[PDB]
């Protein structure tokens, strides 16, 4: 749309269900999954000006998308990452390697050296091993990369951004929840990690399920569905009810962010039927299985919703 609006003469095309393309003359747009699918000559075209939109999708060096993009080497490769580093500096290494392979060291040099934590000398001032004085080394790398990155803060031109609130609420674990938590903690240690596998790495999932939906802590929820969920087993549900009722009486359009869709459905059932107080509030639903057209329709409804 932007291509045909600002610059009609440009020959741009969609590599989703197109044809001709390389057979004809200039610009090509594709999907990352489409790029994976077209591992044919397409990778050998040597697109003079290569630009990737969702750089955040190639953060992982081992991800197939990032490596597939990497094989397509061109004299000018660019990334338009939606966000900078979020998880690890190896992501920045991968991005820079895609755009600037020879200007930065290999994976080892980076990890053993170019790592803000103790690897680079998080105590570079010979202070406590804690990473508090790790400067003049990571700062040097930041200054080296600055001549290769651009960033405009919304406040730079978009000062019209009302106040944000980092209001971290706090809840209390119920006696039932506390008992189950302690039981799991005592019984968690089988190999003490069992390579995670529902003990530490995904025992975190068990802990989260206890915290949120102890009432329906099972895959076979249908057996308990007639009598559960029960908010009495989770004070977080009580806090949610209080806030939702307050915002409904205050007429505020509220957004609720949830974990795996099981919790989503449990909350939906709670609000809809379990508590008549919340049943009075009209609500909307969304999930990862929602249709794209339905997703857009629901977004439009929310932007101008009569719901709560």
């Amino acid at each position: 749309n932007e291509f045909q609006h600002w610059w009609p003469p440009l020959r741009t095309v969609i590599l989703h269900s197109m044809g001709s393309g390389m057979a004809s003359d200039h610009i090509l747009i594709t999907t990352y999954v489409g790029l994976r699918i077209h591992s044919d000559k397409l990778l050998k075209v040597k697109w003079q000006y290569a630009v990737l939109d969702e750089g955040h999708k190639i953060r992982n060096p081992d991800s197939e998308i990032s490596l597939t993009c990497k094989k397509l080497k061109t004299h000018n490769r660019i990334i338009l990452s939606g966000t900078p580093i979020q998880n690890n500096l190896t992501e920045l290494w991968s991005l820079f390697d895609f755009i600037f392979p020879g200007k930065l060291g290999t994976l080892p040099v980076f990890q053993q050296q170019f790592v803000i934590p103790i690897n680079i000398g998080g105590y570079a001032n010979a202070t406590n091993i804690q990473v508090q004085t790790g400067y003049k080394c990571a700062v040097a790398l930041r200054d080296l990369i600055s001549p290769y990155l651009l960033r405009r803060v919304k406040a730079d031109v978009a000062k019209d951004l009302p106040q944000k609130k980092e209001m971290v609420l706090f809840c209390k674990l119920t006696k039932y929840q506390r008992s189950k938590y302690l039981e799991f903690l005592h019984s968690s240690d089988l190999n003490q990690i069992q390579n995670g596998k529902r003990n530490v790495l995904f025992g975190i999932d068990i802990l989260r399920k206890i915290c949120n939906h102890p009432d329906l802590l099972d895959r076979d929820t249908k057996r308990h569905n007639p009598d559960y969920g029960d908010p009495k087993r989770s004070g977080k549900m009580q806090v949610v009810k209080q806030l939702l009722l307050l915002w409904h009486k205050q007429g505020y359009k509220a957004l609720l962010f949830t974990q795996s869709r099981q919790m989503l459905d449990i909350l939906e059932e709670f609000i809809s039927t379990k508590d008549p107080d919340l049943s009075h509030l009209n609500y909307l639903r969304m999930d990862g299985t929602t249709n794209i057209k339905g997703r857009q329709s629901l977004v439009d409804r929310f932007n101008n919703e009569s719901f709560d």
Partner: protein
């Protein structure tokens, strides 16, 4: 009783000679798993198992 076998009076067996009791104890316990599952004693139903 030609080889190491022998002959036994039947009427002695009928009066309690060498009779013995035999006891055999069977064990079974509900399985450890209590994390959303279990294994409970009951009378299984032909239509529900």
């Amino acid at each position: 009783n030609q080889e190491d076998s022998m002959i036994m009076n039947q009427s002695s067996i009928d009066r309690g000679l060498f009779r013995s009791l035999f006891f055999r104890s069977y064990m079974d316990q509900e399985k450890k798993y209590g994390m959303s599952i279990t294994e409970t004693f009951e009378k299984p139903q032909r239509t529900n198992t």
